[PDB]
Design a protein around this ligand. Structure first.
Ligand SMILES: *O=P([O])([O])[C][P@@]([O])(OP([O])(=O)O[C][C]1O[C](N2[C]=NC3=C2N=C([N])[N]C3=O)[C]([O])[C]1[O])=O*
Ligand SMILES: [Mg+2]
Ligand SMILES: [Mg+2]
Ligand SMILES: [Mg+2]
Ligand SMILES: [Mg+2]
Ligand SMILES: [Mg+2]
Ligand SMILES: [Mg+2]
Ligand SMILES: [Mg+2]
Ligand SMILES: [Mg+2]
Ligand SMILES: [Mg+2]
Ligand SMILES: [Mg+2]
Ligand SMILES: [Mg+2]
Ligand SMILES: [Mg+2]
Ligand SMILES: [Mg+2]
Ligand SMILES: [Mg+2]
Ligand SMILES: [Mg+2]
Ligand SMILES: [Mg+2]
Ligand SMILES: [Mg+2]
Ligand SMILES: [Mg+2]
Ligand SMILES: [Mg+2]
Ligand SMILES: [Mg+2]
Ligand SMILES: [Mg+2]
Ligand SMILES: [Mg+2]
Ligand SMILES: [Mg+2]
Ligand SMILES: [Mg+2]
Ligand SMILES: [Mg+2]
Ligand SMILES: [Mg+2]
Ligand SMILES: [Mg+2]
Ligand SMILES: [Mg+2]
Ligand SMILES: [Mg+2]
Ligand SMILES: [Mg+2]
Ligand SMILES: [Mg+2]
Ligand SMILES: [Mg+2]
Ligand SMILES: [Mg+2]
Ligand SMILES: [Mg+2]
Ligand SMILES: [Mg+2]
Ligand SMILES: [Mg+2]
Ligand SMILES: [Mg+2]
Ligand SMILES: [Mg+2]
Ligand SMILES: [Zn+2]
Lengths: 152, 148, 59, 306, 108
RNA sequence: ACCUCGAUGUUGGAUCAGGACAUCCCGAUGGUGCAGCCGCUAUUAAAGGUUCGUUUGUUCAACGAUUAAAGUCCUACGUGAUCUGAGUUCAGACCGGAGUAAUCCAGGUCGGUUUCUAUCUACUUUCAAAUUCCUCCCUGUACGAAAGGACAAGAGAAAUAAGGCCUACUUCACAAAGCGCCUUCCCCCGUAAAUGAUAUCAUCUCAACUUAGUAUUAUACCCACACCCACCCAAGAACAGGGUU
RNA sequence: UCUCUUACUUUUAACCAGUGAAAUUGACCUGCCCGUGAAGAGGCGGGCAUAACACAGCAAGACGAGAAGACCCUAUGGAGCU
RNA sequence: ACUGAACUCCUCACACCCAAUUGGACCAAUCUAUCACCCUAUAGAAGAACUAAUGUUAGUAUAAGUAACAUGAAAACAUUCU
RNA sequence: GUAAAUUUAACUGUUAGUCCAAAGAGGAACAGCUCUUUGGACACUAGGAAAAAACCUUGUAGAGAGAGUAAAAAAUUUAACA
RNA sequence: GCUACCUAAGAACAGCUAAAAGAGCACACCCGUCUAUGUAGCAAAAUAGUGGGAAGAUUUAUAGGUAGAGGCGACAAACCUA
């Protein structure tokens, strides 16, 4: 019975779960794009968004600095987070950490995924685009939209 | 056992006794050995009885091949196409005469389970039973619990 | 399957298709021994009175 | 072979908010069209006879709350809210079993994009947005209501007894100690791998176990009915019922609420709105809260005994 | 506990060949709009993802050349350039990684 | 000594109980050397229940505190591929005795390995119609000579059991739970009485018949044939189920 | 330990991907009640039940599986000891 | 009055339903003597016939695709982190 | 009426038996209990008493889609009195 | 070459209290009281916790000797290559 029970059990305990997510997050802050199994990037995405919120709280805040000092295990990513990542999202509120499924790992056949921070000077992912407006169904719905626009 | 072998219905081949009876045997192909003790009874059969057998029922064509064989045989062919091959290996003269006489008598249908030994082709004369035989009719054909 | 071919009804009502299929109401086994009020007074005149009661008796 | 599809697969980038706005506006107008049933063409309203049974509702269990009475005792209530209730279809007395006529009643509104085609045809013929759950109420045919009418929470009155029935909370494949309340074996006095087992399941002569045997298995996803729950208070603005005690099922599920069937509450329906409360012809709008005469109201002189 | 009798091939064929154990046909599959290499819906195409990961690998190798050793990780945005392709004025302070190729016609 | 020694595991105890009534209690009646409260005996009734502790390994047995009651018996003296080995079925040893001795005791005592991954049958929510005690009134009445002391009707509180729940308390915390809270509705047949023949009285009737007398021909749930890549879920082993406006 | 159990973690467990055993097996298309029977029946008699098939549990039965009973008796079978 | 056997009758042919044991008529494979020459004959001979000994060896099934068994994370596959 | 009996030669095998009717002994005028005697049945086919060794009918062997037969189905319902 | 005993020449025993010590707590080491897992297991005797000894009748590295009607034995009829 796990009704209303968030937070998957990942490693060999609670602390090993925090360390697994910490290593995945440090790899994300350094390389800005990661592929890992799907459950792990789901948990780490939920952590990455609030890490960007702590980075956007400011540099002189001691609590945000403590959190960035814990969660970033390489200590050069703390100036990067407070001076590149947080100024990049100065306008946005919460839409970052785009996550998409990639097919399967070769050996053990796991569900893998890719998350990336937006901005991202890397080449873009082959995102699936919503269907174009000139198709048959959308031109019919555009005719319907224009007709009920002129009727009003 | 009868579930493990095929079965046929009792039948004539081409309605034999209705018009004229016809001998249902076509051929007898004999293969006997000149030297060889296994064909001694058949050797004596070809000596003494096959001439009278050929004169007896002339519908049958008889061939004697006289071939080196360790087991002599007789092949009996019937009118409907069937081929029955029997071995006369180390038999008497009386046993071979009995065998060729029994092959001469029977017809070419299969010797399997023969399944209801009568073949009436119009079994009923007064009219076959249906549930409205032996039942009386009622006025204007009214059913039970009818009104008009 | 033979019980699927059995159609049983508790009253005088039988549905219309089943009444349209019917042949041959079979006779009944028992004779229904015909209670006394249905005795068609000529039959009571047929049967003899078996004994003379005393005239001073009450019933 | 044909592949699967959904509603917004082939829609453009600009057509998805338009279709959401269009269908949301349409079923909002459809819910607002059925607002005055008494002015459309209502079926004939009858007075209450003593052998009568009226329709119920479908509510959504919000949560629980304490509730005090004038003697000082504390009772707990479950707040059932009647979100969007509508009579759907009526089946007469000779058409179901020859015993009692039935009425269908629909639950809260859900999306058209996630129902079967025949269900959408049924609601399109009826004229309502599709409902999540549909319950069948046995009524007598002098209490029949027109299909497409709204049922409200002032259908019930404070001081009455209802019977609520919903799917209980499912607890999965549960072992025999949590399911049937069995005892286990003791813990440490020598026991080898037998701390929560069922033990013996039959006798030795029988050579089988009976069909009624209690074993582990899936526990708790089954319809149960809570009988004889008093309704303390009715809120008319948000359409909330306050039944007494607990109600089977998790919060925000849909429960089926109808008046009690216990013999003690056989014919207490003479003072209840009978066909159903119609908020049009009442000629007097109800207060925001209808209280039983025992409950301490929130505006109260803070009771002092004597 | 031990088996009391050998399960025959009839009972075994009835068990191991029913539709609960057979492989289910899937129909999520269509051609990718670019490169036509048969992706699955809700899944990124492996050919296009292989393209992007090869180019990302070469960009990361050039970054690792420009950063010297480890623990360097600059405090400026980066941006990549191909042959030709003078730096824009808006990419002034940004780090410039130029490898050697034409700019591919999906990375704009 | 009839199956079983190419192995039917043995006593008690734990869990789970099924059944029979020759009934311990709750129900209803006949009689009494039944004035009342307790009682004795007989008929009917198995839907429900039948406690916690000290000693002995004990089933038996003694004792303490209770209760409406702490019932008998069968189920391989129920159930060890669910559990314990406390004694009881070895190898070590001590005491008393028998025996020259080895060794022994239906004599006592300390210690003494409990192996199995479920192939087949059966089964794995039957959706629901609960019982019992106690307090007040009656009443300090009926009853007796006094002590003593009831039925019936009514009201209220509880305990157990079944099904659910998280608003308070508690283990705990975007959940699960109890130590916590809510709900819980029909009988049961042995007799006691009118009219009246066989038998002009009388007689309750394996005479025709009339009452206490039958709860049920009970009502509540549950009952929409196909959008389904994918996401989420108070739904869930997989599958299945609900939402995606 | 218990009255009286409850919550969380790991291993275990279920699904997916790879490799991949062992005891056991007369044949089985392998149901229930009563009775019978080499005396305790899934295969016999009388009744009842009955579309096929996966997956996870439980251990009432198959007088369940391993060890030609280790207890009792026999053998003009052995051996140790006095 | 009918039904009711391997008893009896009816058409045909008849050696053709007991444990241990005994008597008898045949008979496949193999070698040898002489025949035979698409596989047989008359005699002599014997390592001369396997639905069964928890029989021996080898092959493959059932249990079973079951029990069980693995690789700390990202990445430039330089390196970094727990 | 019948057709077998006695003797000679040469051998193996059975000689750890059950139930029924009757005359008995032991036990409880108990046991599917133990031991003798007389007879039958079984360890040999078939039909019947429900399935059934021992109870009844019946034996000498096959084909038949003919017939006559043997044994072969348990019946009872009851207390008035001058 | 395991084990019972003996011979030759060796090695080890942190720290504290040291009453002087086949003394006390306690490491390394030797042994295996109790519990739990495991029972075709990691293991034909293990693992985890809990334990006794740990300056001595201690433990142990090497080589040699005592062998079956026997060797050896702080007598368990104990050990002598599972
Ligand atoms: O000497 P004593 O041992 O006390 C006998 P005493 O006292 O009897 P008394 O007067 O105490 O009466 C005893 C009960 O009788 C009741 N009583 C008296 N008068 C009436 C009643 N009860 C009635 N119901 N109605 C009357 O008229 C008293 O209440 C008392 O309880 O003389
Ligand atoms: Mg894991
Ligand atoms: Mg417990
Ligand atoms: Mg153990
Ligand atoms: Mg345990
Ligand atoms: Mg005997
Ligand atoms: Mg035995
Ligand atoms: Mg055996
Ligand atoms: Mg009784
Ligand atoms: Mg027992
Ligand atoms: Mg058992
Ligand atoms: Mg000990
Ligand atoms: Mg065991
Ligand atoms: Mg079986
Ligand atoms: Mg008094
Ligand atoms: Mg039986
Ligand atoms: Mg069997
Ligand atoms: Mg066994
Ligand atoms: Mg033996
Ligand atoms: Mg002897
Ligand atoms: Mg001897
Ligand atoms: Mg000897
Ligand atoms: Mg000797
Ligand atoms: Mg006959
Ligand atoms: Mg005869
Ligand atoms: Mg040989
Ligand atoms: Mg041989
Ligand atoms: Mg062979
Ligand atoms: Mg064996
Ligand atoms: Mg063999
Ligand atoms: Mg697998
Ligand atoms: Mg298995
Ligand atoms: Mg596993
Ligand atoms: Mg590892
Ligand atoms: Mg006897
Ligand atoms: Mg010392
Ligand atoms: Mg010490
Ligand atoms: Mg020693
Ligand atoms: Mg000794
Ligand atoms: Zn592609």
């Amino acid at each position: 019975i796990s009704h209303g029970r968030v937070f998957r059990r990942m490693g060999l305990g609670p602390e090993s779960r925090i360390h697994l997510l910490r290593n995945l997050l440090t790899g994300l802050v350094r390389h800005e794009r990661i592929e890992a199994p799907w459950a792990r990037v789901d948990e780490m995405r939920g952590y990455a968004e609030k890490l960007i919120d702590y980075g956007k709280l400011g540099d002189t805040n001691e609590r945000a600095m403590r959190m960035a000092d814990f969660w970033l295990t390489e200590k050069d990513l703390i100036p990067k987070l407070f001076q590149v990542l947080a100024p990049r999202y100065k306008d946005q509120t919460g839409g970052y950490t785009r996550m998409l499924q990639i097919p399967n790992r070769s050996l053990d056949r796991a569900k893998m995924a890719v998350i990336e921070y937006k901005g991202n000077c890397l080449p873009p992912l082959p995102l699936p685009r919503r269907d174009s407006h000139l198709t048959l169904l959308n031109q019919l719905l555009q005719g319907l939209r224009q007709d009920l626009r002129q009727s009003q | 056992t009868a579930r493990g072998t095929p079965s046929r219905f009792l039948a004539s081949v081409l309605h034999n006794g209705l018009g004229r009876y016809v001998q249902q045997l076509q051929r007898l192909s004999f293969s006997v050995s000149r030297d060889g003790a296994s064909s001694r009874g058949a050797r004596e059969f070809v000596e003494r009885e096959v001439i009278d057998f050929a004169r007896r029922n002339p519908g049958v064509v008889i061939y004697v091949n006289s071939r080196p064989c360790c087991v002599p045989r007789v092949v009996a062919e019937y009118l409907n196409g069937a081929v029955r091959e029997e071995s006369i290996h180390c038999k008497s003269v009386e046993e071979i005469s009995t065998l060729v006489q029994k092959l001469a008598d029977q017809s070419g249908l299969d010797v399997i389970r023969i399944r209801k030994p009568f073949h009436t082709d119009n079994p009923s004369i007064q009219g076959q039973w249906h549930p409205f035989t032996n039942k009386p009719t009622t006025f204007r054909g009214l059913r039970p619990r009818e009104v008009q | 399957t033979m019980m699927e071919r059995l159609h049983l009804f508790p009253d005088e009502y039988i549905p219309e298709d089943i009444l349209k299929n019917l042949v041959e109401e079979l006779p009944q086994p028992r004779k229904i021994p015909k209670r006394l009020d249905e005795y068609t007074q000529e039959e009571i005149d047929a049967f003899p009175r078996l004994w003379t009661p005393p005239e001073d008796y009450r019933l | 072979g044909k592949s699967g599809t959904w509603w917004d697969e082939h829609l453009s980038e600009e057509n998805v908010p338009f279709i959401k706005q269009l269908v949301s506006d349409e079923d909002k107008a459809q819910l607002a069209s059925k607002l005055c049933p008494l002015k459309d063409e209502p079926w004939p309203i009858h007075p209450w006879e003593p052998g009568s049974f009226r329709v119920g509702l479908i509510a959504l269990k919000l949560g629980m709350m304490p509730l005090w009475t004038k003697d000082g005792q504390k009772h707990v209530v479950t707040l059932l809210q009647v979100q969007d209730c509508h009579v759907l279809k009526y089946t007469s007395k000779e058409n179901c079993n020859g015993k009692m006529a039935t009425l269908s009643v629909g639950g809260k509104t859900v999306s058209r994009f996630r129902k079967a085609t025949s269900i959408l045809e049924f609601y399109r013929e009826l004229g309502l947005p599709p409902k999540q759950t549909v319950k069948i109420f046995n009524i007598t045919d002098n209490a029949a209501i027109k299909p497409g009418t709204p049922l409200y929470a002032a259908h019930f009155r404070p001081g009455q007894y209802v019977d609520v029935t919903a799917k209980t909370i499912g607890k999965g494949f549960q072992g025999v100690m949590k399911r049937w309340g069995f005892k286990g074996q003791p813990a440490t006095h020598g026991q080898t791998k037998t701390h929560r087992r069922p033990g013996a399941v039959a006798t030795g002569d029988i050579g089988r176990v009976w069909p009624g045997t209690k074993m582990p298995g899936k526990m708790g996803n089954i319809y149960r009915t809570e009988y004889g729950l008093k309704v303390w208070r009715i809120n008319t603005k948000h359409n909330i019922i306050y039944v007494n005690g607990s109600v089977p099922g998790h919060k925000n599920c849909l429960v089926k609420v109808k008046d009690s069937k216990l013999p003690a509450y056989k014919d207490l329906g003479k003072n209840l709105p009978f066909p159903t409360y119609f908020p049009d012809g009442d000629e007097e709008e109800l207060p925001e809260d209808l209280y039983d005469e025992n409950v301490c109201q929130p505006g109260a002189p803070s009771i002092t005994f004597a | 506990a031990a088996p009391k009798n050998r399960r025959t091939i009839e009972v075994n064929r009835c068990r191991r060949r029913n539709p609960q154990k057979l492989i289910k046909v899937k129909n999520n599959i269509d051609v990718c709009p670019e490169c036509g290499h048969l992706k699955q819906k809700h899944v990124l195409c492996a050919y296009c993802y292989e393209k992007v990961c090869k180019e990302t690998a070469e960009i990361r190798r050039q970054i690792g050349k420009q950063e010297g050793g480890p623990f360097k990780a600059p405090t400026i945005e980066t941006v990549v350039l191909y042959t030709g392709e003078t730096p824009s004025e808006q990419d002034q302070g940004k780090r410039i990684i130029e490898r050697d190729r034409k700019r591919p016609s999906w990375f704009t």
